Each structure stands twice: as C-alpha cells, then as structure tokens.
RNA sequence: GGCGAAGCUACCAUCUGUGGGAUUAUGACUGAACGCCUCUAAGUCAGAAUCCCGCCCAGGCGGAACGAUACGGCAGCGCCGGAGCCUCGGUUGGCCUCGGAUAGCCGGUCCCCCGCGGGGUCCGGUGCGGAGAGCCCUUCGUCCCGGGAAACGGGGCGGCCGGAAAGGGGGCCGCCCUCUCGCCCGUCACGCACCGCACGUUCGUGGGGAACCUGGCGCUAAACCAUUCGUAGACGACCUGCU
RNA sequence: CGUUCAUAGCGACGUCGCUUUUUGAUCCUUCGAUGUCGGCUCUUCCUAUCAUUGUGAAGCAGAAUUCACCAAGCGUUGGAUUGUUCACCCACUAAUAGGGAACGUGAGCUGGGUUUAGACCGUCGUGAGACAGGUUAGUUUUACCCUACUGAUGAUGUGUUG
RNA sequence: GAGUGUGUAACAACUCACCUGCCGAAUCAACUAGCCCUGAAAAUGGAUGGCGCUGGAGCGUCGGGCCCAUACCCGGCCGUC
RNA sequence: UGCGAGUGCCUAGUGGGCCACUUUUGGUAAGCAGAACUGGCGCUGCGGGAUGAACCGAACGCCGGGUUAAGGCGCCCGAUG
C-alpha cells in the first residue's frame, strides 16, 4: 500500500559514502577556474582551528531591522603560519583525464617538510633528498633541470605550486609538515611558471592569499564520532517505549518483493570523520602575527579602532585544546568544520 | 512518384556578382557579400549563361518531399539578391495603452534596452543579430528601424524584440502591448 | 598485422558488425577516432534511446549496477560487448584484442587507419536521412573531454598537413626522376607494362 | 540536595546551502509543398522545478610524476659490454600518417593578387592508375671475366635539431679505416646430389626464474611489529613524537 | 444546456476502449503452515498533476476561478471521535492529489478488535449449544547460518615503500 | 442578388456575390485502400532474445545460393523378429 | 488397392486427466466449467518457436558420408560477405 501521510527524506542522498576519510589533510577537489587577465596570485591555503569567540560589529545593510544597529557574532580563530615553498608541478589535459608532466622539487627543504615522506623520522637515516639536490651546484645538474623548466612552458597547461605549512611557529606537539599542491592562477603559463621560480624557498604570507571581507570557502574533515545508531548517524524518529527489540532503530526497512536493503535505506554506522567542503565563508580580520621591533608587539592583535585594548587574540589562559597563537590568522564567519587542532584548508 | 526531371531558372539583375563553391553560393554587390552554404539539400547548383545572367536548379529522381525543397532555393536567392541590391528595412512600431515604451540603442544598434513597458521596473536587454543595425525613426514619435542585409538575421532581431514584450498571466486580448512588425520593406526601393 | 580502423564516418552498428567478427578470428583490430562515428535518425531520437539507458539502474544499489559509460570509445566498446560471448573465456580473451581509443594516440598518429566500406555513412545511408554523431551525443550525457580533443586533433591534423607536404614534395621529385632517366631505363618499363604495370 | 570545569549535545544557540549546456511544452523567422499562405517539409531563434554536466561524497583487478632503494662482520643490488640449461605461448615480410566532399575530387605551373600558405584563372584524369583492384624488399650462396648502373654511393664515433594525448632505434657534418663485392644482363664451375615421403623457412640476443663467467662504473636504505600520542577509535584502521 | 451560439465549459439517446488502488467470477500455486486487520517507523516507484516551474484557451476587464500540455524535481500538516481501512469536524497551509511495492512493512513494534480455552446480556433450540449480534480479560518464540546493505580491515598488479 | 456585410428614427454613403484590366497549365470535390501518427496512463530498472539496424538488419511479393534433427539414402556393428 | 488369417485360456495396471484445428452449451469474459470427431502431452526424447506440456517438422539401438523438413543465413550463432 502507498504511505499514509508524506513525509522527507531523512539524510542527505549526496552523502552515501559515509566512511571514514582515506586522507587527514582537506583536500581541495576542484580549483577556481583559470583566466588569462588578472595577475599571477594563490588560491587555496592549509590553516588550523584555533577556536571560535564574538565578534560586536556594527551592520549597516540596508532595508533590515538591524540596520545601524550593532550584533554579536560568532567567529572562528584559524592561526595561518607562512608557507615554505618547495616545489612546483606542471599539468597537461589528457582525454584520459587531467595528467601530470613533471615534478620539480627546490633544492633546500626544510627538516619539517622532510618529516611527510617518511612513516618512522626516529628509526630513519634521513637520506631523504640526498642525492636530488646535488642536481643544483653543478652546472650539468643545472642544464638537465633549465630544458625540464622549459619543458613546462610548451607542453603544461595547468601548473601548480608545491607548498608546507611550518611547525616551529605553533603550539602543536606534531612536527611533521602537510603539503599541498595549489593551483597558481593568472596570465599565460610561461610568466605565471616564472613568477613561481622566482617564489622558490620563499616565504608565502598570508596577505598575499587572502585580503579584507573576501568570501571564501573552507575544505577540512568532520570531526569524528565513532561508530553511532542511526538514530543520531540520520537523525531518525525514535520508536516508542513498548517496542521489545529497542527504539534507537529504524523499524520497518522495505517491502517484500526486492527492497533487499538500498542504499538509500537510513543505517547505522560510521558517524564524523566525513570530508567536507563548506562554502561561502566571510572574513572579517586577516591577522598579523607576534613581531618585535624593540617591545612585545600584544598591543595589535585584537586591538579595533574603538576598542585600543593591548589584549590579542588568545584569551585568559589561551585557547582551550589548542595552544596560544603566535602567528598571524585568518578569522572566519560562524563555525567551520573540524575540531581543535584540525588541518584545514 | 519520382520525378524524372524539375527546374527553374533564377534571372539574376548585371549590377549582381555571384559566384559558387560547389553549393556554397556566394552573393555579393553594392551593399556587401552574403555567404550561404546550400548543402543537405541534395539538389546540383548550375551556374550558366555568359556574364552570368541566370542561376539554374534541378532535381533528378526526387519524390515530393524534395519537390518542396526546389523553390525554397531559388527563394532563399532572391531574398540574398534582394538583400544586396536594395537590403532589408523592417519597421518596428511599439504599440502602448497607457505605459509608453521606451526604446534607445546602445552601441550602433546591437544592444537594445526596453523600459517602461507596462511599468515593468525590470529593463529588458536584448542583443541583434550579427549584421543587423537597429535605429530610431523620424517623423513619428515611437517606431523602430532595422538595417541588414540577410533576410533571417534581420527577420529574427525583430521577433526577438517582439518575443521580449510580451505580457504574462493577463489576457492578452484585452492588453494589446508590446512592439510588433509594421511593415517588411527595403533600404532603396528602386 | 594489426588493422587500425577510422572511426568517422561510420554507422555504429554496422562497423561494430565487422569488428566483432573480425576479432572473434584472432585478428586485433584498433578503432580510432571514436567522436567519429555518425548514428541514423535525427538527433533527438538517438539522444533519448541513450538517456532511456541511463535510467537502466538497479534501485537498491546502482554502484553495481549497470555502467554507464560516457566517452565515445566506451560506447562503441559497449555495443561491441553486446555482440561478443563475453561470459565466455573465448569472449574474454576477445576483447583484449580490441584496443579502441579516442582521437589519435600517438601509437597511431603514424599509421594508415583502414575504412570499411561496408559501414560508412554516404554508402549505407540514404542522403535524404538524418544522422547524428556519437561525439556531439556524449557531450551531452556527461563526457566532458571534447574541447580537449578538439584542440588535440586540431594539432595532430595540421601536423600531418606538413608530412604529406612533405610527402608531395618527394612526389614531384619521384615524378622529376623518370623525365631526366627515361633514355636508360627504357630497357626496364615496357617489360612492366606489358604485364600491365603502369598503364 | 545546590552550583559546576572540560567533553558531547538542541533549529532549545549559531554558520552555510551554487553555475552552465541541450532542448520538452510553447511562441516564432525564412520558406515551399499548393507561383497565395503557413513554426516544417530542408534550415534557424527564444524556451523551464525537465534531462545532463558543473558544486559536494567515494575513488576501478586504472593510470601519472617524484624521493629513497639494504657497506656490516658478511653479503646483496642497479646500468653497460660471452655459452650451455627449464618454462610460456602464438608466430612464418613490412606499408613511416592529410583533411574532407559524396548533386563532387586529385595534382601542377603559377603569366595575377595577398600573409612556404591562400584565392581566381589555366591544364590532364575522375569506376579512381599521384589506383590498398594498390606501394617497397625479395634471401640459395660463392668463386673468374665481360656488358648496363654508380663515381656525389654501401659500411665503420662524436656534436646539432624535430617528438608529451599513452612521447621517434628519425634527419645533417665528417673522420685516422675498407670497395668498384653489394643490385640489372651474359661465360665459368663448386657447395652431403643425405638416393620421392611431415611439423622446413623469421619477429628470436622473445617474456619469467635459477645459478655459474669475464671486465668496468655507482650504491647505501625503507616498511612493519613494540612504545607514545588522541585531532582518531568495537578490534583492526587513522594522526603524532621518540641522542 | 450555456441570455442568441453544439463543441469556453458541458453534453442526453447511443457507442468504443484502459486499469487492477473496489467488489465480483475461477480454483491454477501452497493445508509435513508463506504468521490472518489496523496503527507507528522507514525506503523506493507510477501519473490518472492538488500546489510550485514553464505555457496555450476561457461566458480570462483586474482579482479570483475553470479546460488543456511538457512535467513526479520538491511538498502534501496538527488534532477531537472510532481498533478501524473508511468516515465527519476544527485550525493552519501553496496544497492539505490519488495510489503501488505478497491489499509494502509482527525473527521491526503494538495487540485495539477480529480468531482458542473463563464469563455476561438479547434471540433461537426441550437440551447440549449456535449467532459475520454486543461487552470484558486473555504468553506475539529464535539470527551466531547464506545473501543484501551499513560501516572496518584488506587482496589483485605497479621490482619495494612513501 | 427585388440582395451577404457596415451605420442612420428612414435616408446619404461604402462593400460583397458577379463581370471586366494583367499573368499562362492542369486543377477541384467526395469516397476508398496501404505504411506512419494521434487516440494510447502504473507503480524494482526492462527487453523484436540482446547488441543494434533506416540505399534496412523495418513491411509486402518473390528469384537463386547456403546451414542442420536421433528426419530420408548408402555403408559398418549389436540385438529382436 | 494392400495385408499370411482364425481361435481358446489366464492375466497385471487403469477407472482424478489435460491441451489443440473444427462444431458447440452456461457464463460479459476467463489459463472458467461442461459435450462431439481427430491428433498430441500424460508415457516422448530431437531440430525449430530466445526461454517452454499441448505449437511446426519429425518420433529415437551405437557410428561415418551425403541430403533435407520446420525454421532460418548483420554479430552473439552454422549459413545471403
């Protein structure tokens, strides 16, 4: 028989796959796309989950209630460390797909960013490396790689830029560096693959990112949750008290014929841990970091035009699970995803 | 039944340049070329007669599914002579109740812009085609003029913007608005 | 020993009719330049006999359900699949000998790609009907890869358009030779052409 | 029984939720059929909670690039340059490329004009003979001489270029060294002539493993378990640290 | 009929078809058992489309409201009574459209009334008892096996790992 | 046309049927038979058997050629009569 | 026209049938129920109709060659390549 009264679908039909992640670092699954008239500049970024506070600003959109009027707000911490970078790989379209054509690696690279290729640093003999960068000194070392630069600038189409995130300059007890390639967007791929030989071994801010209220999206994995009912892995209607096989449970599954369980039926299992994209995140403060000229420079971290505190960023005791930042930060509208200490991009 | 033989000749005027690659016939003259490939027609195109005074088109063994195809060749040349000779000159006049419309060219007639048209706040922006020129008359207070030199590039503009003011979930018996064709002419009349 | 076969221009079924038997004989056959292949009927009825397919899925689980490709090369390997034993070890070992790519790899962007005139599209259909491609109809149900073809073959077209350049100007050289040599190898071409070379 | 750190939690607090393509229905343009007219017959336009793609999730008995590849007290590897011996199977010359039209093509000089390419004109074919009804090589061999072809050619180490969609044993400069042997016509003989009896004849230094060989060049680790971490977790698994 | 006007909307007297979401007809499957009604929960599908998207026609002046088309993507509620499927009413809403999946769904739940054994009332029967008349109380067993699915290890090849 | 339409208290007035001015070959009307379309809407995704097919691999009428069943002929063997 | 005929004893099993061309009863109709002739399945394999009670052909000891019925000859799949 057809149901009785109509009713939605509990759980999101894009989602099936919820397993967890087959990788810690977000994942940025799809770059902005290319255009050959503004200048050569990043666009994707690793930052960390600090934590969240309020932010007392004033709105002034016109038409609304709250217009002149002040609000409170919720907003996200993520200390955002300077990337090294240490490499630049080249792209080439196949009707096969998207196919890479070279990797080329810089010729320092810091012990951090040499921690990634290597499941053991204790019980290593850190030979990682070794003899790649003799390619550089000599002079035929130096002409192998001048044809292989040249080789991008013909045959590659999209060409992205290897880059590390630094764990000298944060609070936390891991020393192993994430890398991420991020796709350079700009002009034709001989000046954009030049401006990113110039950049090699630099320091990247983050202001050469991200600037003032950009709207930008944030990629990060779910914080986990173990292995829940599908009372709380779907959300589902709980069954009443005189049922004698439980009530934290979907009760019926599907009909008799082949309904032989879908994918589309709520089940339980796997809760959190889940790779998301969330999108359409405002920023408000783009941070600057701890620096000395002659004095301890707190003044300016948290410190507003009306406001003219010495606090910075880091309350009473500093952020709770995470550390105290150190570094300049990124400072991103309502909650994002993940949990402390959580790598997001 | 399948015709053994049909045929029409097309008298082409001397101040006419025509000349064909294959089918792809090309028009050409005082006012400019015109370039129309006549292929998936499977009809030959014979150009004959000295200082090229006559196009001719036939078709050989055909049932009456290509019969009908025979005069929509020599229609659509003509309308390429006539579009070279002497162009095309479709008069748009806008008919309002109370609203008035009001029309103005942008660049030299591509973009066209419709406001006020029965007090609708949302501006109506519609591109010509290719080719085709869009101006304002004279001597009468609101009708628009269009220039070209193709007979469907032209013909479409003007249902373009007679398609754009069109009125929705009202009976359009009553609310007789919006800008319609006038009258199908020439640049020159000769 | 290996046929390379020309895809443009060819019925899908009728080119499939050839290639499938021919690879049943222990005979490999590569198709190439799949975006070729032209289906009779207007567009409109193609398009929907492809997206009635595309709604072939298994209710309670469509990853194992029915695959539905969508690159032009894996829609001919599809209709050859249909024309084969391939639940068979024989059918099995069958498709290992067809190798069916899209535009040109280059593998064979230096060979001669062999026409059947038994499925092209001038011979078999008539002129007055409607046909439709198989690279314009993927686009549409999802392959994405067409503007990178296009580019591809675009540049594997003008590359050849030097070679046989070339080609000609050792032609006209070839042509040239027998105009100056003639008075000494007049002992050697009637013995041709009277064994009907050269005539 | 109050209050309550941290952690979980509520639309019971808070944040976010997308861009294109084709077209359906429809409204049309040109326009015959049916010298008139018509959205239709060829063709063309607009066209949506539709369909598909983009966004987001997983990532295939699917590929790609890069790094390190076992100095120890042995050993063991990688690249390049001789004979026997196991297994696996088909195999019996290669064709090294235009695009495209089908009521239409091919190749030229270009007296002519634009930036070797294009257009007009002119010239010979068009069941294709600048033919895949087709092209190249053809192997029984060696020994002397004469005739046709060659003298600018065969063969024997370094520099310079063209190739990326899954990348070509391709072209040019010579040399310190060897020929009128290579291939086309004719004299002259020889080669176990195995006495009629079948898997003969190549791509075959074919792919994989075992150990012997001679010489040269270059190498020095990684993973897992154990412990810790707790951004994770039923257990596995995942993120970390540890002279 | 529709103020005149058959076909805007309708349509008698006639006539042609579709459906198994109704009752029928048959006994073809099962009586070495396929757990027999509803309600709750949940998944999917159909269009004979209630509303939303796009449209055409109205006895379409506007508004409101009817007829028709592509169209199942998204929704179709909270409750009083009754075990109810149904049914009626109140309020909100864009609408509160119709259905299928062994008349979906009992090793998912309940047992409310059907349908055991105890009883009471009314009718019938001399009687034991009968009533598809009404009321009351009346045990809802087992997955650790295979498959499906949810998650979690892995495996196959890339000489080994990242 | 003692008249088909437009407007007057009725007139006035215009226009249609019809005829003439120009053009030059088949046209019109009603039935009837084939192929195709509408009529034609159900629930797991769905079936000329599938792939596919449109100078058919769709339909009708046919002509050669070709395939095989334990069917027929010939031959070998067994058994029964 | 063709076939060697007649006759006497015991005697198992069967006594639920079904389908089809044609005729035909009741029923709107039914893969419904009930009749006549004939042929089949039951009891029977084989080729074909993709699959299969009853449809077409054809009935069977074990094999080789040849040829066919009904069906077929784009591929699966033998054959119009």
Redesign the interface.
């Known amino acids: 028989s057809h149901r009785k009264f109509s009713a939605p679908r509990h759980g999101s039909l894009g989602f099936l796959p919820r397993k967890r992640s087959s990788r810690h670092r977000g994942k940025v699954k799809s770059f902005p796309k290319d255009d050959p008239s503004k200048p050569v500049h990043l666009t994707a970024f690793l930052g960390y989950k600090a934590g969240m506070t309020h932010i007392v600003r004033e709105v002034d959109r016109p038409g609304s209630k709250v217009n002149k009027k002040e609000v409170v707000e919720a907003v996200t911490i993520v200390e955002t460390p300077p990337m090294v970078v240490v490499g630049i790989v080249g792209y080439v379209?196949?009707?096969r797909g998207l196919r890479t054509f070279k990797t080329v690696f810089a010729e320092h690279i810091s012990d951090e960013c040499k921690r990634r290729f290597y499941k053991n640093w204790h019980k290593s003999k850190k030979k990682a490396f070794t003899k790649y960068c003799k390619k550089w000194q000599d002079d035929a070392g130096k002409r192998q790689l001048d044809k292989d630069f040249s080789s991008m600038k013909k045959y590659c189409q999209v060409i992205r830029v290897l880059a590390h995130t630094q764990m000298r300059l944060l609070p936390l007890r891991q020393k192993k560096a994430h890398l991420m390639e991020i796709q350079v967007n700009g002009g034709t791929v001989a000046e954009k693959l030049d401006w990113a030989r110039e950049r090699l071994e630099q320091q990247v801010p983050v202001s050469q990112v991200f600037g003032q209220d950009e709207m930008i999206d944030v990629i990060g994995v779910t914080k986990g949750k173990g292995y829940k009912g599908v009372t709380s892995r779907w959300h589902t209607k709980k069954l009443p008290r005189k049922t004698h096989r439980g009530l934290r449970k979907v009760a019926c599954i599907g009909a008799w014929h082949?309904?032989?369980?879908?994918?589309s039926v709520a089940r339980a299992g796997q809760k959190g841990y889940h790779h998301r994209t969330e999108i359409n995140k405002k920023i408000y403060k783009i941070g600057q970091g701890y620096l000395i000229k002659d004095g301890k420079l707190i003044k300016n971290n948290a410190s507003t035009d009306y406001d003219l505190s010495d606090k910075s960023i880091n309350p009473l005791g500093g952020f709770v699970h995470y550390g105290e930042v150190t570094n300049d930060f990124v400072m991103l509208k309502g909650c994002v995803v993940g949990t402390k200490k959580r790598v997001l991009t | 039944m399948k015709t053994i033989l049909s045929n029409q000749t097309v008298d082409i005027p001397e101040n006419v340049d025509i000349s064909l690659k294959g089918r792809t016939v090309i028009v050409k003259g005082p006012r400019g070329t015109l370039r129309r490939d006549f292929n998936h027609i499977?009809v030959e195109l014979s150009l004959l007669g000295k200082k090229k005074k006559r196009l001719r088109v036939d078709k050989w063994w055909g049932n009456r599914?290509?019969l009908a195809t025979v005069r929509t060749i020599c229609s659509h040349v003509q309308n390429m002579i006539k579009g070279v000779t002497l162009g095309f000159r479709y008069k748009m006049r806008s008919v309002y109740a109370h609203f008035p419309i009001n029309v103005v060219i942008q660049e030299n007639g591509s973009l066209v812009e419709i406001r006020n048209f029965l007090g609708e706040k949302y501006i109506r922006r519609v591109r010509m085609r290719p080719g085709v020129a869009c101006s304002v008359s004279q001597a009468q207070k609101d009708e628009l003029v269009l220039e070209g030199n193709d007979i469907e590039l032209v013909s479409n503009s003007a249902a373009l913007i007679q398609q754009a003011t069109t009125v929705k979930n009202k009976d359009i018996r009553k609310f007789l608005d919006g800008i319609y064709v006038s009258e199908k002419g020439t640049v020159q009349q000769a | 020993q290996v046929l390379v076969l020309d895809g443009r221009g060819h019925l899908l079924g009728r080119l499939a009719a050839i290639v499938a038997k021919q690879v049943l004989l222990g005979r490999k056959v590569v198709v190439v330049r799949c975006e070729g292949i032209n289906i009779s009927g207007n567009f409109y009825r193609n398009k929907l006999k492809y997206l009635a397919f595309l709604r072939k899925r298994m209710?309670?689980?469509?990853?194992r359900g029915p695959y539905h490709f969508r690159?032009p090369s894996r829609i001919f390997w599809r209709t050859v699949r249909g024309m084969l034993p391939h639940k068979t070890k024989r059918g099995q070992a069958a498709l290992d000998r067809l190798k069916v790519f899209?535009?040109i790899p280059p593998p064979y962007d230096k060979k001669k790609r062999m026409v059947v005139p038994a499925a092209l599209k001038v011979v078999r259909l008539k002129?007055?009907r409607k046909f439709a491609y198989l690279g314009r109809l993927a686009h549409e149900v999802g392959w994405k890869?067409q503007a990178?073809?296009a580019t591809?073959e675009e540049k594997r077209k003008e590359k050849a358009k030097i070679h046989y350049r070339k080609k000609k100007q050792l032609m006209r050289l070839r042509k040239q030779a027998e105009k100056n040599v003639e008075k000494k190898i007049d002992r050697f071409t009637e013995v041709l052409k009277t064994h009907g070379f050269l005539v």
Do not use: H, I, M, W
């Open positions: 379209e196949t009707p082949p309904a032989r369980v879908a994918f | 499977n599914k290509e | 209710n309670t689980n469509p990853s690159a899209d535009g002129p007055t890869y990178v073809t591809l």
